[PDB]
Amino acid sequence: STGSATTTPIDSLDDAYITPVQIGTPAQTLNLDFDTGSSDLWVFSSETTASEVDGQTIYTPSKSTTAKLLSGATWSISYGDGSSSSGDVYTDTVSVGGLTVTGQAVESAKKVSSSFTEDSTIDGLLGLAFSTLNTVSPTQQKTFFDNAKASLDSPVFTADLGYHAPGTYNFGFIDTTAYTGSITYTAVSTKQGFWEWTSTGYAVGSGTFKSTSIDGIADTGTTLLYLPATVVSAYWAQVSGAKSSSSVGGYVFPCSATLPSFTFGVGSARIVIPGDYIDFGPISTGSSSCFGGIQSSAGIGINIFGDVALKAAFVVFNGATTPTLGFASK
Numbered sequence: 001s002t003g004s005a006t007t008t009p010i011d012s013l014d015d016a017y018i019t020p021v022q023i024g025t026p027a028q029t030l031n032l033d034f035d036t037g038s039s040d041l042w043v044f045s046s047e048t049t050a051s052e053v054d055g056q057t058i059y060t061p062s063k064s065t066t067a068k069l070l071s072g073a074t075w076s077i078s079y080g081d082g083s084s085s086s087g088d089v090y091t092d093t094v095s096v097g098g099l100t101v102t103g104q105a106v107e108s109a110k111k112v113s114s115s116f117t118e119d120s121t122i123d124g125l126l127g128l129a130f131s132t133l134n135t136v137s138p139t140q141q142k143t144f145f146d147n148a149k150a151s152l153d154s155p156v157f158t159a160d161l162g163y164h165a166p167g168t169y170n171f172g173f174i175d176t177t178a179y180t181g182s183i184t185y186t187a188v189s190t191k192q193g194f195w196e197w198t199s200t201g202y203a204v205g206s207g208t209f210k211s212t213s214i215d216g217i218a219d220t221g222t223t224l225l226y227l228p229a230t231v232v233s234a235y236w237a238q239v240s241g242a243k244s245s246s247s248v249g250g251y252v253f254p255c256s257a258t259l260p261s262f263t264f265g266v267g268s269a270r271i272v273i274p275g276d277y278i279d280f281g282p283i284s285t286g287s288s289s290c291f292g293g294i295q296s297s298a299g300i301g302i303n304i305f306g307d308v309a310l311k312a313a314f315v316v317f318n319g320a321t322t323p324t325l326g327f328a329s330k
């Protein structure tokens with residue numbers, strides 16, 4: 001089997017991407033944030049505290065003839081940005097782009113933190129990291145990809161995120177029309193439960209490539225590119241007037257600037273992030289200070305190849321017995 005679904009930016013900055021997902025019988029379609037940095041499929045629901053729902057579409061298990069309470073199971077998750085959610089668990093039929101999994105754990109939120117409430121466009125998250133990170137207790141549950149994997153034509157999914165435009169998540173096949181050149185594959189460590197890999201270096205604009213190992217994670221659920229402070233300082237030093245602002249929370253730059261590109265290495269290959277992808281716009285409405293899309297990972301504990309980096313590439317998440325990542329230009 002295969003599936004193919006379009007993923008759409010939630011706003012004009014590509015702060016996140018939503019993909020429609022069918023849950024239950026008859027189908028209830030919710031727009032979920034596909035997240036290769038976590039491993040829980042959770043949704044706003046008829047159980048979510050009413051004051052914490054503000055415009056989201058909810059899953060109502062009592063209206064699904066295939067929903068079953070997973071008795072005694074609870075979940076609770078906290079993400080790197082400080083947001084969180086928790087609740088109980090149903091199993092139900094879940095379909096993405098024509099690919100159907102029966103008996104998928106659908107984690108129903110009873111509580112969500114303010115950042116989820118305030119984002120009316122995101123109805124929940126669909127985790128695509130390794131199932132060892134799933135938070136359901138006392139019986140850990142499998143991700144949608146892990147449940148689908150044996151049925152797929154090939155044990156893979158691909159992320160093809162657009163810049164200011166829709167893109168595609170495919171399951172079970174690699175669309176050879178969606179990228180240019182060849183795909184370069186690189187090793188993955190699953191020891192932390194992430195799609196963790198080692199970039200071979202970077203360049204700033206037209207500058208020379210610096211060969212240096214940068215361990216980090218491919219995370220579709222993180223907006224920006226978080227890299228070591230040395231690398232980030234070298235980037236922003238090429239932008240007149242750019243500075244790190246403790247009050248704002250990262251590097252800012254004059255909105256009048258033209259940003260240089262940023263290149264990262266995948267083995268001997270190179271992925272170029274155009275300068276425009278690094279512009280996250282005014283820090284507040286009407287400001288002439290703009291927020292940068294490359295930020296320091298110092299204090300996070302891990303480097304994160306988030307959407308800023310991933311949307312410059314066609315990315316293969318290879319879930320074979322030994323997982324690997326593939327990157328191609330597009």
Ligand SMILES: CC(=O)Nc1cccnc1N
Nearest residue numbers: 035037079080081221222
């Ligand atoms: C850095 C970070 O926390 N990212 C993130 C936030 C919420 C959900 N998934 C994620 N991958």
